[PDB]
Amino acid sequence: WGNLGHETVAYIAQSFVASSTESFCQNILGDDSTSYLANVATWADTYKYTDAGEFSKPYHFIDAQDNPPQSCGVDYDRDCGSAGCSISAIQNYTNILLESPNGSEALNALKFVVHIIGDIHQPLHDENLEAGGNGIDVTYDGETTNLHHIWDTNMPEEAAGGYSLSVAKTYADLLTERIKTGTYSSKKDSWTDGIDIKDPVSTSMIWAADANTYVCSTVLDDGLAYINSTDLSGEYYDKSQPVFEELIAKAGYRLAAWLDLIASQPS
Ligand SMILES: Nc1ccn([C@@H]2O[C@H](COP(=O)(O)O)[C@@H](O)[C@H]2O)c(=O)n1
Ligand SMILES: *[C@@H]1O[C@H](CO)[C@@H](O)[C@H](O)[C@H]1NC(C)=O
Ligand SMILES: *[C@@H]1O[C@H](CO)[C@@H](O)[C@H](O)[C@H]1NC(C)=O
Ligand SMILES: [Ca+2]
Ligand SMILES: [Ca+2]
Ligand SMILES: [Zn+2]
Numbered sequence: 628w629g630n631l632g633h634e635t636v637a638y639i640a641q642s643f644v645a646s647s648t649e650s651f652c653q654n655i656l657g658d659d660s661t662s663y664l665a666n667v668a669t670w671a672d673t674y675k676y677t678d679a680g681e682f683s684k685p686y687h688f689i690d691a692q693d694n695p696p697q698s699c700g701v702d703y704d705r706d707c708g709s710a711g712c713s714i715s716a717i718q719n720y721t722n723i724l725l726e727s728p729n730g731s732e733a734l735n736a737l738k739f740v741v742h743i744i745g746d747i748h749q750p751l752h753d754e755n756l757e758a759g760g761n762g763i764d765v766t767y768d769g770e771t772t773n774l775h776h777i778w779d780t781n782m783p784e785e786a787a788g789g790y791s792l793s794v795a796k797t798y799a800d801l802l803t804e805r806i807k808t809g810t811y812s813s814k815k816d817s818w819t820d821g822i823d824i825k826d827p828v829s830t831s832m833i834w835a836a837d838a839n840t841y842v843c844s845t846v847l848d849d850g851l852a853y854i855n856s857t858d859l860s861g862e863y864y865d866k867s868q869p870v871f872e873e874l875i876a877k878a879g880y881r882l883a884a885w886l887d888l889i890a891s892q893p894s
């Protein structure tokens with residue numbers, strides 16, 4: 628996602644973490660504001676453009692070598708690759724926070740986890756075709772862009788009504804309501820099935836596989852004749868909106884559950 632989606636994921640997670648988890652994170656981040664996770668949720672996307680952070684570019688995605696929309700699937704050993712991926716990064720940075728939470732690496736590990744759990748839930752961050760859809764040029768509200776970009780940025784920002792941190796906070800409030808009492812309230816109790824702090828790869832692969840299903844059902848079902856030739860701000864946006872909203876909600880809810888397990892200690 629772009630910045631709005633990552634900040635939204637982070638604000639949702641803040642609404643679901645335990646108090647002890649909130650304290651654990653605020654202490655690592657040096658931030659006890661009511662934006663502590665949202666304030667770092669975009670860091671990985673600035674870091675990756677620097678010489679020191681170039682190593683981390685591949686950590687934003689897992690390039691699933693499936694065949695959408697006919698067939699979707701993610702395979703860690705097939706798809707991660709030698710340079711690492713979102714799944715290998717979740718393992719590495721989770722284990723830093725479990726083993727060395729008071730050490731110098733915990734700060735960036737936490738900022739990576741906050742960001743990357745968000746990215747796992749962007750379906751085109753779980754898809755090899757055309758580099759996650761970057762190579763698929765599209766028109767969106769009369770503008771030339773690409774299919775990856777409209778999932779990251781154009782569509783979530785249209786739905787949220789803007790791009791800023793305060794717009795993200797409002798959007799997160801909306802999606803948090805849908806989890807607690809609204810749209811998602813009868814589904815969300817299943818959203819952490821399979822979670823296992825002892826197996827970060829298995830856990831994050833369940834999430835990536837979930838998001839990847841929507842590459843076939845939603846991102847590409849209409850087919851590329853339609854997608855290449857049509858302004859995607861109309862009916863394509865209308866069908867995409869419920870899907871990216873639920874995936875942003877899932878990312879925040881799952882990030883909260885994961886941070887709770889990272890911070891957990893038996894009383
Ligand atoms: N194979 C790739 C290449 C890029 N990406 C994502 O596409 C976006 C644009 O990446 P590039 O700037 O590398 O073209 C980023 O969000 C990046 O994480 C991806 O999801 N799969
Ligand atoms: C784990 O993270 C550290 C710090 O960013 C990095 O140096 C290291 O290469 C990572 N290891 C793996 C296996 O991704
Ligand atoms: C859609 O555009 C992509 C990327 O340029 C291309 O690979 C694909 O063949 C196109 N499909 C159609 C039916 O136009
Ligand atoms: Ca909770
Ligand atoms: Ca690739
Ligand atoms: Zn992102």
Ligand SMILES: [Zn+2]
Pocket residue numbers: 628629749752775779
């Ligand atoms: Zn992206």
Ligand SMILES: [Zn+2]
Pocket residue numbers: 628671672687742746
């Ligand atoms: Zn990213």
